Design an enzyme around this catalytic site. Sequence first.
Site, PDB file in Angstrom:
ATOM      1  N   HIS A  78      49.799  41.964  48.318  1.00 23.51           N
ATOM      2  CA  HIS A  78      48.958  40.983  47.643  1.00 23.51           C
ATOM      3  C   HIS A  78      49.507  40.652  46.272  1.00 23.51           C
ATOM      4  O   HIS A  78      50.185  41.463  45.644  1.00 23.51           O
ATOM      5  CB  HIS A  78      47.532  41.507  47.500  1.00 23.51           C
ATOM      6  N   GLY A  79      49.194  39.450  45.808  1.00 22.40           N
ATOM      7  CA  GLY A  79      49.653  39.023  44.505  1.00 22.40           C
ATOM      8  C   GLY A  79      48.748  39.485  43.381  1.00 22.40           C
ATOM      9  O   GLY A  79      47.890  40.362  43.565  1.00 22.40           O
ATOM     10  N   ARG A 120      55.147  56.632  37.710  1.00 20.09           N
ATOM     11  CA  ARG A 120      56.320  56.622  38.573  1.00 20.09           C
ATOM     12  C   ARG A 120      56.780  57.907  39.276  1.00 20.09           C
ATOM     13  O   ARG A 120      57.614  57.852  40.174  1.00 20.09           O
ATOM     14  CB  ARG A 120      57.481  55.998  37.799  1.00 20.09           C
ATOM     15  N   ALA A 125      42.696  40.174  39.312  1.00 16.83           N
ATOM     16  CA  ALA A 125      41.988  39.941  38.065  1.00 16.83           C
ATOM     17  C   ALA A 125      42.338  41.037  37.076  1.00 16.83           C
ATOM     18  O   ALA A 125      42.524  40.783  35.896  1.00 16.83           O
ATOM     19  CB  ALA A 125      40.503  39.924  38.313  1.00 16.83           C
ATOM     20  N   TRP A 126      42.429  42.264  37.557  1.00 19.89           N
ATOM     21  CA  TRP A 126      42.769  43.360  36.678  1.00 19.89           C
ATOM     22  C   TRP A 126      44.244  43.368  36.325  1.00 19.89           C
ATOM     23  O   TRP A 126      44.648  43.947  35.311  1.00 19.89           O
ATOM     24  CB  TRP A 126      42.351  44.686  37.302  1.00 19.89           C
ATOM     25  N   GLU A 130      45.207  50.794  48.099  1.00 23.94           N
ATOM     26  CA  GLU A 130      46.163  50.990  47.024  1.00 23.94           C
ATOM     27  C   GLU A 130      46.007  52.451  46.657  1.00 23.94           C
ATOM     28  O   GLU A 130      44.982  53.060  46.948  1.00 23.94           O
ATOM     29  CB  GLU A 130      45.804  50.110  45.823  1.00 23.94           C
ATOM     30  N   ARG A 131      47.019  53.023  46.033  1.00 28.82           N
ATOM     31  CA  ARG A 131      46.943  54.418  45.653  1.00 28.82           C
ATOM     32  C   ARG A 131      45.829  54.603  44.635  1.00 28.82           C
ATOM     33  O   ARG A 131      45.701  53.799  43.703  1.00 28.82           O
ATOM     34  CB  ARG A 131      48.274  54.852  45.068  1.00 28.82           C
ATOM     35  N   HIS A 175      48.833  46.898  49.882  1.00 30.17           N
ATOM     36  CA  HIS A 175      49.140  47.114  48.484  1.00 30.17           C
ATOM     37  C   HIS A 175      50.507  47.720  48.256  1.00 30.17           C
ATOM     38  O   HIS A 175      51.132  48.247  49.178  1.00 30.17           O
ATOM     39  CB  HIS A 175      48.081  48.021  47.886  1.00 30.17           C
ATOM     40  N   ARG A 232      41.548  42.016  47.171  1.00 27.59           N
ATOM     41  CA  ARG A 232      42.850  41.448  46.896  1.00 27.59           C
ATOM     42  C   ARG A 232      43.772  41.410  48.113  1.00 27.59           C
ATOM     43  O   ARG A 232      44.516  40.443  48.305  1.00 27.59           O
ATOM     44  CB  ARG A 232      43.498  42.191  45.727  1.00 27.59           C
TER      45      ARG A 232
END
Lengths: 242, 245
Positions: free
Chosen positions: B10-11, B116, B14-15, B88-89, B185, B61
């Site tokens: 996803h692109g 990371r 908002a966050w 997402e994680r 994600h 998203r």
Amino acid sequence: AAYKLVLIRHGESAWNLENRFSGWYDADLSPAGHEEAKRGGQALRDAGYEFDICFTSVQKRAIRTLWTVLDAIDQMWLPVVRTWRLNERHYGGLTGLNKAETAAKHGEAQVKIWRRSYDVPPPPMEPDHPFYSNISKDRRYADLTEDQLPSCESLKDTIARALPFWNEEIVPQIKEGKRVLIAAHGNSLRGIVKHLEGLSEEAIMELNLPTGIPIVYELDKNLKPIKPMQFLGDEETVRKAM
Amino acid sequence: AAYKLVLIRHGESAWNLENRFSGWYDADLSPAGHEEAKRGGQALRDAGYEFDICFTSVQKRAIRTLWTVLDAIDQMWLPVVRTWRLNERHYGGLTGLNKAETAAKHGEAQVKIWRRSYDVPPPPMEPDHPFYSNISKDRRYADLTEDQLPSCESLKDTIARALPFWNEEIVPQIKEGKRVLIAAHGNSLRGIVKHLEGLSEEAIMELNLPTGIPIVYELDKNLKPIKPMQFLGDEETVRKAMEAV
Ligand SMILES: [Cl-]
């Protein structure tokens, strides 16, 4: 009191304002029809409704209505199940034809039969029909057996291929306590309603569900309406659809 | 060219433009992010791609990205399956915090580890966290066992709960010849990529999939990619994200 079921008939489609018979043609919602879905969602959102699973057809106008509602009530994460069995009734050869013109060639009487009769299917969609391939050859229905893929359907037919899905897929969910939301079409929805209320063929024939308006059912442990269907929405819209 | 698998991250959310850690927070796509999906969908439409089943997370998203793509390629009728396993994680306590401030308040180093490192999870999301209820008490995850619902995840954890879905639910489909489309994600998708390409931990840690761009994989009889992942879209787009690797 107990089980609450919500149904929603998609609003105006592109072919609706073109005054054409759609049937299985995958006509999209018209801007107005989209707006309708948007308001219905808002109603559900204001009433604070929550669902656990959604069922819709494999047709844009219905699916998009579902999407709009789910978006409105912040429940895009709900699992949704699509099925041709909830598709609008197949209008056979009438598909694509202008309703007014069809009435003119064939007359009122004949057209009322084709649209308002319970078991008289419209003319079959022949291989030379402008939408034969568009519909019958759509990847979408690849898994339907030769008998399953219809060339036309009467309401009784539509209903006949819908109730099965309702019995093996939806009912189970309701019984397990899952709050179901069904976004479909006029005729397929009629099938559910006729079944729930045990209406006569004559009865279901006269019934016309409102579009874009959330139809709420309250069922007892036996999936039976403990009261008549109610419509969510502003005083005007709600009352108006009665 | 045997099996065809398409992934799409996803692109912008908002966050994302608020520069905040989202994790499991259900942030929606930003107008730009929506446009990305639209372009991505359009690329697939021009390439004439056809799918048979879709898999996405239970996060807006991603779901909205899927919807936009399906709409673009006139395949809204496709069956879609949602799963938190493609979420997402989970960013634990970092959820909602501003990335810049977090770097300032804990130090570049510490954050680079949380952002990371492969197996160092971020701080747990405590019951008094601003989004504790919003995330962990969301009806959405009601069927997760006390162990499944995470309070934080390291990239390693994410992959750990994404692959089981991939193997048990997605792989079968691919093997039956179904053309799959996965809208998810960054980190969950990383899990799939790491698995497909058998990349090392150091490897996948550096890999950053492009957003909104259709990622195409060509797998052999054993879901093994036969070539590097290709990206779909106009040169300026593909080339720009192409140069990343
Ligand atoms: Cl969906």
